[PDB]
Amino acid sequence: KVFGRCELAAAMKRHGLDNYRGYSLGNWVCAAKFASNFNTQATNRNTDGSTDYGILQINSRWWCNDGRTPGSRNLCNIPCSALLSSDITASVNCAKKIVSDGNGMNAWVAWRNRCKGTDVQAWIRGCRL
Ligand SMILES: [Cl-]
Ligand SMILES: [Cl-]
Ligand code: NA
């Protein structure tokens, strides 16, 4: 599914991401926009052999099992395919474990390089929330 900006904002809000660990909703929407262009089916393979999955581009070396990333750790205890669903629940649940890990949202390269330190509230401007 390719989300609209406000539709995803609303879905993330319902799943408890607004101010989760201090990160306002705009941060989460910005990170999804630059990680996947709001497409739940996005995949990108990395040079280390791991692959990033879904709306928030969660990586198979640490967080999910895709059966082809050797010595990977499934800390979210989920097949990576679960992260490509039109229902974002699995993605949100796994993201909450990632952002709690120590480095906050710096775990997402697209967030750190394109969202961090920008006016992230712009991403939820206009939305009924
Ligand atoms: Cl915000
Ligand atoms: Cl980047
Ligand atoms: Na893994």
Curated annotation (Swiss-Prot):
Q: Which residues bind substrate?
A: D101
Q: Spell out the molecular function terms from Gene Ontology.
A: beta-N-acetylglucosaminidase activity; identical protein binding; lysozyme activity
- The entry's keywords: Allergen, Antimicrobial, Bacteriolytic enzyme, Disulfide bond, Glycosidase, Hydrolase, Secreted, Signal
Q: Where in the cell is it found?
A: Secreted
The annotated active site, in chain numbering, is: A35, D52
> What broad class of enzyme is this?
hydrolase
Spell out the CDD domains in the cross-references.
LYZ_C (cd16897)
Subunit-level organization: Monomer.
The molecule here is called Lysozyme C
The species is: Gallus gallus
